[PDB]
Design a protein around this ligand. Structure first.
Ligand SMILES: O=C(O)[C@H]1CCC[C@H]1c1ccsc1
Length: 435
């Protein structure tokens, strides 16, 4: 696999050992061949597991989630997928890695898709080798793949709201359950219902993931309510997965706004990754997978693929060339390569709006391509009346950096900046000039 001009897809089923057994063997051989290597982790939780499995080996951890001594002579770097794309974007020298190992190479976040594109172009150009590790490579149509122990699969009506009757099977279970909901707001409602019935619930989402995941190991729990974030290597000591089979999809309507369409069916890869949380211990057969709907290829027309093209168009590769998206997923977006390329100053603003401002890729591009500087928040208030953001059924209000009380009405409307209470809180701080 380590030979140049080769992209290997390590499509071993969930729980085969692609991090504890396979990853250390690859690292040993790369170190032996003097190959400059990058290991890409989907999350900081997965990067911490990798440190444990690669202990002793000379690896430079470019993550604060690891507290180890660095010798200074390490030719293998380890960082998250977003950290990799971020460094490609910033005016920082990134080594020309000979070997590129991406773990959970199915991750659909804009920065993961952009890293797959950039790396796969280098491999296609004959400049490097790559190993994409995932049980569900792009294109998979199997929602029920092989597992370490048998799984009982049940098509059942899964609740998406609080319930009084009709779902005795949910609460009459003794084991621990991982329940995949389509959104934070939907998880809050089910969690309240379970808590009221006497259950201990932990809630996981992209923002609370590193902090809350530790509670799954430090305290007794009956249920873990999670969004699609737990599809990227989250390991649980559970015996049941309840899968609504639904998700929200960010969609660009008319090219002027982003809405959160759905809930709608998850792809076959998401259903297999969600089911993949259980059936992992061959000494405990009979884990349950209760699923509440079917699968469809809903990644077509999803904003993340357009956003990945916005990132790649602003990453230098070779003079006037631009990295293509990884071939099995290049059709999920109708885009022109280079159409999102920004000039040096607008590109710096774009990067700062995503990195410091914490705005979604699409929103940062709208603002940066309009000639607006990072600290100028006038656009958060000069939009049309239908762009008014609502909180508690009343227009959301902030005090501007000028000390004036205004209604939040952004020039560009992205549903993700007000999807939950936490998102709107951070966006109110942004519009106020707080970061
Ligand atoms: O994390 C992602 O994938 C997206 C979501 C918004 C920020 C963006 C990003 C981060 C690193 S490079 C581009």
């Amino acid at each position: 696999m380590l030979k140049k001009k080769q992209l290997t897809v390590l499509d071993l089923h969930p729980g085969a050992g692609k991090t504890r057994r396979v990853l250390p063997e690859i690292v040993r051989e790369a170190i032996k061949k003097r190959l400059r290597t990058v290991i890409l982790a989907p999350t900081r939780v997965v990067a911490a597991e990798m440190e444990e499995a690669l202990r002793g080996l000379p690896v430079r951890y470019m993550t604060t989630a690891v507290n180890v001594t660095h010798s200074g002579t390490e030719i293998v770097d380890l960082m998250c997928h977003a950290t990799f794309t971020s460094r490609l974007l910033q005016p920082i020298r990134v080594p020309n890695y000979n070997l590129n190992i991406m773990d959970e190479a199915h991750f659909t976040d804009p920065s993961s898709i952009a890293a797959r594109g950039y790396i796969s172009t280098r491999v296609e150009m004959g400049e490097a080798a790559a190993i994409f590790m995932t049980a569900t490579p792009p294109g998979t149509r199997d929602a029920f793949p092989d597992s370490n122990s048998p799984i009982m699969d049940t098509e059942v009506e899964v609740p998406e709201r609080a319930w009084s009757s009709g779902f005795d099977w949910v609460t009459d279970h003794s084991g621990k359950t991982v329940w995949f909901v389509p959104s934070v707001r939907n998880g809050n409602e089910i969690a309240a219902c379970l808590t009221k019935a006497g259950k201990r619930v932990i809630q996981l989402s992209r923002k609370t993931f590193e902090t809350e995941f530790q509670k799954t190991k430090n305290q007794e729990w009956d249920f873990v309510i999670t969004t699609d974030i737990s599809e990227m290597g989250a390991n649980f000591k559970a015996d049941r997965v309840i899968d609504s089979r639904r998700c929200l999809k960010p969609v660009i309507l008319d090219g002027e706004r982003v809405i959160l369409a759905g809930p709608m069916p998850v792809t076959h890869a998401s259903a297999a990754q969600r089911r993949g949380r259980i059936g992992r211990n061959p000494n405990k057969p009979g884990d349950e997978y209760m699923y509440g709907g079917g699968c469809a290829e809903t990644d077509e027309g999803h904003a993340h693929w357009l956003e990945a093209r916005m990132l790649l168009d602003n990453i230098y590769l070779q003079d006037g060339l631009i990295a293509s998206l990884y071939r099995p997923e290049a059709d999920k977006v109708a885009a022109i390569e280079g159409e999102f390329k920004l000039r040096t100053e607008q590109r710096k603003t774009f990067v700062e709006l995503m990195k410091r401002g914490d705005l979604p890729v699409w929103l940062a591009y709208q603002v940066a391509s309009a000639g607006i500087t990072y600290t100028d928040r006038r656009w958060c208030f000069d939009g049309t009346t239908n762009n008014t953001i609502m909180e508690d059924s009343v227009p959301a209000e902030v005090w501007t950096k000028y000390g004036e009380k205004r209604v939040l009405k952004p020039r560009w409307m992205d549903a993700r900046v007000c999807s939950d209470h936490a998102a709107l809180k951070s966006f109110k701080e942004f519009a106020a000039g707080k970061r």
